[PDB]
Design an enzyme around this catalytic site. Structure first.
Site, PDB file in Angstrom:
ATOM      1  N   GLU A  57       0.870  -1.161   0.000  1.00 52.38           N
ATOM      2  CA  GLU A  57       0.000   0.000   0.000  1.00 52.38           C
ATOM      3  C   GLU A  57       0.925   1.235   0.000  1.00 52.38           C
ATOM      4  OE1 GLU A  57      -1.918   0.692   3.726  1.00 52.38           O
ATOM      5  OE2 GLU A  57      -3.476   1.998   2.874  1.00 52.38           O
ATOM      6  N   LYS A 156     -10.282   1.356  -0.628  1.00 50.01           N
ATOM      7  CA  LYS A 156     -10.156   1.063   0.809  1.00 50.01           C
ATOM      8  C   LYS A 156     -11.359   1.550   1.606  1.00 50.01           C
ATOM      9  CE  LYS A 156      -6.671   1.273   4.552  1.00 50.01           C
ATOM     10  NZ  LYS A 156      -5.522   2.064   5.085  1.00 50.01           N
ATOM     11  N   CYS A 189      -4.423  -3.086   4.227  1.00 53.96           N
ATOM     12  CA  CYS A 189      -3.985  -2.663   5.566  1.00 53.96           C
ATOM     13  C   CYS A 189      -5.058  -2.744   6.683  1.00 53.96           C
ATOM     14  CB  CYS A 189      -3.389  -1.261   5.480  1.00 53.96           C
ATOM     15  SG  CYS A 189      -2.146  -0.931   6.746  1.00 53.96           S
TER      16      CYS A 189
END
Ligand SMILES: *[C@@H]1O[C@H](CO)[C@@H](O[C@@H]2O[C@H](CO)[C@@H](O[C@@H]3O[C@H](CO[C@@H]4O[C@H](CO)[C@@H](O)[C@H](O[C@@H]5O[C@H](CO)[C@@H](O)[C@H](O)[C@@H]5O)[C@@H]4O)[C@@H](O)[C@H](O[C@@H]4O[C@H](CO)[C@@H](O)[C@H](O)[C@@H]4O)[C@@H]3O)[C@H](O)[C@H]2NC(C)=O)[C@H](O)[C@H]1NC(C)=O
Ligand SMILES: *[C@@H]1O[C@H](CO)[C@@H](O[C@@H]2O[C@H](CO)[C@@H](O[C@@H]3O[C@H](CO[C@@H]4O[C@H](CO)[C@@H](O)[C@H](O)[C@@H]4O)[C@@H](O)[C@H](O[C@@H]4O[C@H](CO)[C@@H](O)[C@H](O)[C@@H]4O)[C@@H]3O)[C@H](O)[C@H]2NC(C)=O)[C@H](O)[C@H]1NC(C)=O
Ligand SMILES: O=C(c1cnc(NCc2cnccn2)nc1)N1CCC2(CCOCC2)C1
Ligand SMILES: *[C@@H]1O[C@H](CO)[C@@H](O)[C@H](O)[C@H]1NC(C)=O
Ligand SMILES: *[C@@H]1O[C@H](CO)[C@@H](O)[C@H](O)[C@H]1NC(C)=O
Ligand code: NA
Length: 461
Positions: A57, A156, A189
Site C-alpha cells: 500500500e 479502501k 492494511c
C-alpha cells in the site's frame, strides 16, 4: 494444484513534501522512480516462476498528503468490467501512465500484479455525497492479470487516522478475481481489523486466497504485521499474501506468505533500509472446512487456579487483568468481565529475571481506531516489574516445552498468534483444536514473546 506466490517488501522513495501541490510531471517522475524498483521485483518474481506478485500500500507515492497535494498523483481508474488491457490500448481512458506501466509489467512478465495506487472520480454538485472539491479520491488496489488486463479495482473501506486525503466508498466493495490457481479476494492494511469486506470475502464469497497490500506500523505484543496477518490467515482458514512497506523509522516491516495451517515465508527487518522479495508455493484450493468453536473447551472446564494476586496492566492503551505465572509449570485462569482465559504451560527452564503473565481483556479499543476486542494472552513482561506486562518486548530467553491457551470467547472470529524472540513466527509448532485451544505440537524453536487468542466482536464496534 499449487502455485508460486510472491510478495515484495518495499523501501519506498517518498515525495520531498509539501507546502504547495507538485505538477503532474513531478508526481509522475516520483511514481516512476518507485515503479522502476517494483519492476525489479516483478521481473525477478516472474523469472523465479511466481504466478502472482503483491506490492505494498502507498508503495508508489507514500502517505504524507492532504487532498490537494495528493491530486496530481491520481488517475481515473475505470470499472474492471470495461475489459481493458492498458498496455494494448494506452489512451482508451485518457492520461493513465501508471495503469499502462502496471499493465505492461503484468503482460511482459506473464504474471499477475497487485499494486496500490490512487483513484480520482470527478463528481457534480448534483449528488449530495460529492465533496466540495468536485471529486472523490480513493486509496485503490489494482490487479492486472498475466495478459495485462485490469481484473480488479478496490477502494479502501476502512481508513486509518489522518487519511484525510481519501474518501470512503458508499457501500463496502467486495472485490474478487478468479484465476486458474484459485479464487482471490482483496483488501488493504487497516481493513484486516474490520468485518467489511475482509470477513465477507472469506465467509460469503468463499475465496481461497487474500492478496493484501499494507503500510503497517508494528505494535507489539499483538499487532506486529507478521504476527497478526498470519494469525488472521489461520483464523479465517485462507491463503494470505501480505506485502508491506519497508520503513524501520515508522516501525514498518513484516511481509509474508501465509497458508491456513502455518506461515510459509516471512520477513522482518528493522536493521537495513533494503526491500525484500519473498516467494513460496501454496495450494490453489486449500481446505477451508477445519471449523473451530472458540468458547467450547473454556466454557466446559472450571477455574484452573484459585485466589490469586491479579493486577491491571496496559496493553496498547487497553487495561487487561493479569495473573503472574509463578513456577516453571502451571495452570491458571484469569477473567475480565465476560471473558475467562485458561493457560496450561511448561517452560524449557526457569530463566532468571524474566516474568510472564496471563492476561484477559474484554472491551472496546479507542486509541487510533475503534474496535471491540476479547483477548487471552500469554505474554513476556518487558522487565521484572509487573507494571511493564503488556509493554512491547522484542526479546525473550524462555523457550516453552508446552502451552495450551483458551478462552470463553463471545465470538467466532479469533486469530491465533504465536510470536517468538525477536519477531519470529513459529511454523508449524502449534495448532488450533476444534475445541478452541491454541496449543504447542513441539517445544518452541526459540524463546516465546507471546501466545495470544485475538478475538473481534464486530457487532460491538
Ligand atoms: C472460479 O474458477 C473456478 C475454476 O475454473 C470455478 O470452479 C470450477 O467450476 C466448474 C463449474 O462448476 C467445475 O466443473 C465441474 O466439475 C465437476 C467435477 O468435479 C471436479 O473434478 C475436478 C477434476 O478432478 C476438480 O478440479 C474439481 O474441483 C475440486 O472440487 C473438490 C470437491 O469436489 C474440492 O475438494 C477441490 O478444492 C476442488 O474445488 C472437482 O472435484 C464435473 O462433474 C462438472 O460436470 C460437468 O458440467 C459441465 C458443465 O459445467 C459439462 O461440461 C460436463 O459434461 C459435466 O456435466 C463440471 O466440469 C470445476 O470443478 C470447478 N473447479 C474448481 C477448481 O473449483 C469457479 O466456479 C469460478 N468461480 C466463480 C465465482 O466464477
Ligand atoms: C460453541 O459451543 C458452545 C458450547 O456448547 C455453544 O454454546 C451453547 O449453546 C447452547 C445452545 O445450543 C446453549 O444452551 C442453552 O442454554 C440456555 C441457558 O443456559 C445457561 O447458559 C450458560 C452460559 O451462558 C451455561 O453455562 C448454562 O448452561 C446456563 O444454564 C438455556 O436456556 C437453553 O435451554 C433450552 O431450552 C429449550 C426450551 O426453550 C429446550 O428445548 C432445550 O433443550 C434447552 O434446554 C439452552 O440449553 C448454551 O448455553 C451455550 N453455552 C455457552 C457457554 O454459550 C455455542 O453456541 C457454539 N457456537 C457455535 C457458533 O456453534
Ligand atoms: O492502515 C494503516 C495502518 C493500520 N494499522 C497499523 N498498525 C496497527 C494499529 C491498529 N490500530 C491502531 C494503531 N495501529 N499500521 C498502519 N495505515 C494506512 C497508511 C498509514 C501509513 C502511515 O501513516 C498513517 C497511515 C498506516
Ligand atoms: C512491455 O513490452 C512492450 C513491447 O513488447 C513495450 O512497449 C513496453 O514498454 C514494455 N513495458 C514494460 C514495463 O516492460
Ligand atoms: C496442570 O494441569 C495438567 C492437566 O490437568 C496436569 O497434568 C499438570 O500436572 C498441572 N500442573 C500444575 C503445576 O498444576
Ligand atoms: Na493525510
Amino acid at each position: 494444484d499449487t502455485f508460486t506466490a510472491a510478495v515484495y517488501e518495499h523501501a519506498a522513495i517518498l515525495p520531498n513534501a509539501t507546502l504547495t501541490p507538485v505538477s503532474r510531471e513531478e508526481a509522475l517522475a516520483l511514481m516512476n522512480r518507485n515503479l522502476d524498483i517494483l519492476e525489479g521485483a516483478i521481473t525477478s518474481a516472474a523469472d523465479q516462476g511466481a504466478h502472482i506478485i503483491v506490492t505494498p500500500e502507498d508503495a508508489i507515492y507514500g502517505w504524507n498528503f492532504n487532498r490537494d497535494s495528493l491530486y496530481p498523483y491520481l488517475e481515473d481508474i475505470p470499472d474492471p468490467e470495461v475489459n481493458w488491457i492498458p498496455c494494448n490500448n494506452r489512451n482508451r481512458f485518457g492520461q493513465t501512465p501508471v495503469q499502462e506501466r502496471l499493465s505492461c509489467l503484468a503482460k511482459n512478465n506473464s504474471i499477475y500484479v497487485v499494486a496500490n495506487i490512487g483513484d480520482k472520480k470527478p463528481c457534480d454538485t448534483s449528488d449530495p455525497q460529492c465533496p466540495p472539491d468536485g471529486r472523490y479520491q480513493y486509496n485503490t488496489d489494482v490487479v492486472f492479470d498475466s495478459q495485462g488486463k485490469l481484473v480488479a479495482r478496490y477502494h479502501k473501506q476502512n481508513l486509518f487516522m489522518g487519511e484525510n486525503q481519501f474518501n470512503v466508498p458508499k457501500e463496502p466493495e467486495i472485490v474478487t478475481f478468479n484465476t486458474t490457481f484459485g479464487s482471490f479476494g482483496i483488501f488493504t492494511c487497516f481493513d484486516i481489523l474490520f468485518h467489511d469486506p475482509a470477513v465477507t470475502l472469506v465467509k460469503d464469497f468463499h475465496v481461497d486466497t487474500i492478496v493484501f497490500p499494507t503500510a503497517w506500523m508494528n505494535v507489539l505484543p499483538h499487532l506486529s504485521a507478521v504476527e497478526f496477518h498470519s494469525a488472521w490467515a489461520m483464523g479465517m482458514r485462507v491463503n494470505f499474501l501480505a506485502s508491506n512497506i519497508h520503513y524501520p523509522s515508522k516501525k514498518m516491516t513484516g511481509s509474508g506468505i501465509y497458508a491456513p495451517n502455518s506461515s510459509r515465508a516471512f520477513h522482518y527487518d528493522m536493521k537495513t533500509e533494503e526491500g525484500k522479495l519473498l516467494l513460496s508455493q501454496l495450494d490453489s484450493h486449500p481446505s477451508h472446512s477445519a471449523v473451530v468453536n472458540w468458547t467450547s473447551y473454556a466454557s466446559s472446564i472450571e477455574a484452573l487456579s484459585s485466589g490469586n494476586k491479579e493486577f491491571k496492566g496496559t496493553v496498547f492503551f487497553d487495561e487487561f487483568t493479569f495473573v503472574k505465572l509463578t513456577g516453571v509449570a502451571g495452570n491458571y485462569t484469569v477473567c475480565q468481565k465476560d471473558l475467562c482465559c485458561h493457560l496450561s504451560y511448561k517452560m524449557s527452564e526457569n530463566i532468571p529475571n524474566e516474568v510472564y503473565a496471563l492476561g484477559a481483556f474484554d472491551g472496546l479499543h479507542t486509541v487510533e481506531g475503534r474496535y471491540y476486542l476479547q483477548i487471552c494472552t500469554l505474554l513476556k513482561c518487558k522487565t521484572t516489574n509487573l507494571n511493564t506486562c503488556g509493554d512491547s518486548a522484542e526479546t525473550a530467553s524462555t523457550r516453552f516445552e508446552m502451552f495450551s491457551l483458551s478462552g470463553t470467547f463471545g465470538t467466532q472470529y479469533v486469530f491465533p498468534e504465536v510470536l517468538l524472540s525477536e519477531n519470529q513466527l513459529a511454523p508449524g509448532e502449534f495448532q488450533v483444536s476444534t475445541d478452541g485451544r491454541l496449543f504447542s505440537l513441539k517445544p518452541t524453536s526459540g524463546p516465546v514473546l507471546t501466545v495470544t487468542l485475538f478475538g473481534r466482536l464486530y457487532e460491538k464496534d
